[PDB]
Each structure stands twice: as structure tokens, then as C-alpha cells.
Design a protein around this ligand. Structure first.
Ligand code: HEM
Length: 399
């Protein structure tokens, strides 16, 4: 399914790139995006796949497209253009976006995340305890996939024995399953809604500092937030911290499994581990959402029309050597860490302080128990591209 070239796309900007099926994806997600970003590639290219859209191809363009809601709107953020779930406020621009973002920040700000450290550490040390003694696990299935849900429960103050039902709804909400995932999506979305509904009402007026009470008792323009807007926000809190983290955790663990020497460095320098979370985010970005050109305008040599879509592969910032010299090296002494792994502008990831915390703590709790490890011989991870980079089959071994 290719669309005809529109009149505002010159011939020399056309590249045949399927964001869901990248040339070479089986050698890795980052490798495959980077093979797109050949030397001399124009800042903005265009593809007939996935509805036809432009793609920002370097750090400079990704940053700029991410950070000007006047020129590039969150009205449509997914490709292909199709959208029934608002997921507010991820599709609002300022000023609409702003009070919803303020509710989100009440649960996710840096000072708040500090106090949640011990619970996150308790999750990580628990998960790892399950298999430390074995000398083997599939990191993807036995840690990565389990960790974010477990963190949500602690953060939303939810009974741990509801993990099976929430995991099911998350599976349906994040990776739905022709051409009716409509039904699959709705099972996830509606089920989660029914699940949280009474906790929302019992937590109004409440004094807990969990995410649900925090969201439900928030104000939007002088009034307390609509019941359902609060449902939307809480659901967003669940999703946002799921798919990004599941996959991001596996990507760096794969890397560390294949770099025992880098493992020794971290293991020996606690503070260097702790201070190099940024470097990890630069090196393993996972998201490529989109912005909608908000109004006709000239940009990067071309004429964009209101309604055009620009894909923002965050991998093309972190791995851009115009931004970070020697971008393939995971360098914990890297002085200047330029990336858009969390996006930019007003929608810049609300979970970034949590994310940094989860990744550091995972890594500390990992090396306390498993100082040395490698990837199981004769195995290879399986990758997918799309909105969020996917990896599985991360069997790891240790003495
Ligand atoms: C590896 C970790 C993560 C990465 C790489 C990541 C990436 C991103 C990016 C790129 C965006 C911007 C989407 C856009 O508008 O284009 C975003 C938004 C968001 N993320 Fe994260 N994220 C991560 C972890 C988390 C976590 C742990 C949470 C916790 C709930 C979270 C919650 C959110 C929320 C609520 C938004 C919407 C913010 C807004 O639209 O104002 N994320 N994330």
C-alpha cells in the first residue's frame, strides 16, 4: 500500500521506508534506523508507505519539530493518520494541554519520584531474586515485561494480586490483535476503565499520595477534574510507563550482556553508573511518534501543507553523529549528551524522572546479584519497529 506522491514532495525527497518494516530490522532496531540515515540524507524525507508522510532525519530536525506546537501540532501523533481514543492530553496543544499536564506532573515530578525510590528498588530486587540462583533467565519475559506493571501497582497503590487482570488489559491496550483490534483495543480500554472506576470514587477527597487519588483530586480551570478525564489520565499513566520501559530495559541489557568490560566499569564505579542514565537514553531511544503540520508553511527546503505528517524517529537524534560524536559507543564519561529520547517541547515525557530512576535502580539491583553475565550462545533477539521499538528473546546466563 503506497500512496501517490503529492505535488509538495519533490522527487529527490522520496524514500521507500516502512516504519513498521525497516530494511534490516533483524540485525537490530537502532542499526536499521541508522542504515536509513546515510551520509548526506536531507533533513526531511518522504515515504509513500503508512499513508505517505515526511520523516525528520537528524537530531536538529527532530528537536525542532518536537518543540513548536504552533508549526507542528499534536492533533495527530500516530501513523497511519487513523484516533478514537483521545488519550488526553497527548493530543492537545497548549494551552489546552497545560492543566492536564499539571495533574500528570503532581505524580511524576522529580521531588515526588525521590520518595518512591525504595518501592522501585523493592520491585527490582524482588524480580531479580526470582532467578538469581538459576544462572539463567529470559530478561525480556522474566524482568522487563514484569517490572513496569509491578511499579504501577506500587505507585497507584493497588493490590499485587491484580497483576494478572491488569497485565491482560495492558497487553490489549499496548499491542492489540484483521481489521478488528478495534475489539481487542476496546477490551483493554473498557476493562481497565471498569477496574479503576470504583477506586476513583473511593479516593476522591482522599489523603493518599498514590497516582489515582492524586489525579482524581486535580483541578482543571478552577473546577475538579471530570471523572472520565481522570480515568483517561490514569490510563495514560499506565500505558506511558509500559511499552517504552519494557523494551528500553531489554535494549541496554542486551548491550551490557555483549560488553562485559563496560559492565566491570559500572560495577566498579557506582557514581558513574548513577550519573550515566542520560547516556543510556541517548544510545537506546525507542519512540517514533509524529507531529501534524499545523498550518501551511515552508520548512527545510519544502512546502508543507496543513495536515501533512512528520515522523520523529528519536533514534535519529541520539544516534546522530552530528549531535554526538562516536554515537555508537555507550560512553559513561560522555560530556555532552544530546538526544530527544523523551521527546521535547510541552509533551516532553512526564515519566522521565521515573524512567531514569527505574533504569538506575534496575541496574544497581542487577549488579548486586549478577555482577557478570552474557547473552546465551546461539541465541539472537527478535526486533520490531513501529511506534515503540520492540525486542524479545533476551536469554542471559551467569555463574
Ligand atoms: C524508557 C522510558 C521512556 C521513554 C523513552 C519515554 C518516551 C516518551 C516520549 C518520546 C514522549 C512524548 C510523546 C510525544 O508527545 O511525542 C512521552 C510522553 C509521555 N510519557 Fe514517557 N517515556 C518513558 C517512560 C515513561 C514512564 C516510566 C512514564 C510513567 C508513567 C511515562 C509517561 C509518559 C506520559 C504521561 C507522557 C505524555 C506527556 C504529555 O503529553 O505531556 N513515560 N514519553
Amino acid at each position: 500500500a503506497k500512496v501517490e506522491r503529492p505535488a509538495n514532495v519533490p522527487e529527490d525527497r522520496v524514500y521507500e521506508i516502512d516504519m513498521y518494516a525497516l530494511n534490516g530490522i533483524e540485525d537490530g532496531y537502532h542499526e536499521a534506523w541508522k542504515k536509513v540515515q546515510h551520509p548526506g540524507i536531507p533533513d526531511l524525507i518522504w515515504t509513500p508507505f503508512t499513508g505517505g508522510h515526511w520523516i525528520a532525519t537528524n537530531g536538529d530536525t527532530v528537536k525542532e519539530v518536537y518543540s513548536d506546537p504552533t508549526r507542528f501540532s499534536s492533533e495527530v501523533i500516530f501513523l497511519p493518520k487513523e484516533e478514537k481514543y483521545q488519550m488526553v492530553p497527548t493530543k492537545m496543544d497548549p494551552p489546552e494541554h497545560t492543566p492536564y499536564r499539571k495533574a500528570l506532573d503532581k505524580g511524576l515530578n522529580l521531588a515526588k519520584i525521590r520518595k518512591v525510590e525504595d518501592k522501585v528498588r523493592e520491585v527490582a530486587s524482588s524480580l531479580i531474586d526470582s532467578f538469581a540462583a538459576r544462572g539463567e533467565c529470559d530478561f525480556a519475559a522474566e524482568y522487563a515485561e514484569l517490572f513496569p506493571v509491578h511499579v504501577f501497582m506500587a505507585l497507584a497503590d493497588l493490590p499485587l494480586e491484580d497483576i494478572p487482570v491488569l497485565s491482560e488489559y495492558a497487553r490489549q491496550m499496548t499491542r492489540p490483535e484483521p481489521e478488528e483490534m478495534a475489539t481487542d483495543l476496546e477490551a483493554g480500554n473498557n476493562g481497565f476503565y471498569a477496574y479503576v472506576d470504583p477506586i476513583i470514587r473511593a479516593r476522591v477527597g482522599g489523603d493518599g499520595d498514590d497516582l489515582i487519588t492524586l489525579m482524581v483530586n486535580s483541578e482543571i480551570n478552577g473546577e475538579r477534574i471530570a471523572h472520565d478525564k481522570a480515568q483517561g489520565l490514569i490510563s495514560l499513566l499506565l500505558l506511558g510507563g509500559l511499552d517504552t520501559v519494557v523494551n528500553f530495559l531489554s535494549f541496554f541489557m542486551i548491550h551490557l550482556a555483549r560488553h562485559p568490560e563496560l559492565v566491570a566499569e559500572l560495577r566498579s564505579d557506582p557514581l558513574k553508573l548513577m550519573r550515566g542514565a542520560e547516556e543510556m537514553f541517548r544510545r537506546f531511544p525507542v519512540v517514533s511518534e509524529a507531529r501534524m503540520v499545523a498550518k501551511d508553511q515552508e520548512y527545510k527546503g519544502v512546502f508543507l501543507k496543513r495536515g501533512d505528517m512528520i515522523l520523529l524517529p528519536t533514534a535519529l537524534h541520539g544516534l546522530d553523529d552530528a549531535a554526538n560524536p562516536e554515537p555508537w559507543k555507550l560512553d559513561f564519561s560522555r560530556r555532552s549528551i544530546s538526544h530527544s529520547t523523551f521527546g521535547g517541547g510541552p509533551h516532553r515525557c512526564a515519566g522521565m524522572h521515573l524512567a531514569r530512576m527505574e533504569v538506575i535502580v534496575t541496574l544497581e539491583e542487577w549488579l548486586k546479584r549478577i555482577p557478570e553475565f552474557s547473552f546465551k550462545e546461539g541465541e539472537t533477539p527478535i526486533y520490531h519497529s513501529g511506534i515503540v521499538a520492540a525486542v524479545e528473546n533476551v536469554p542471559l546466563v551467569w555463574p
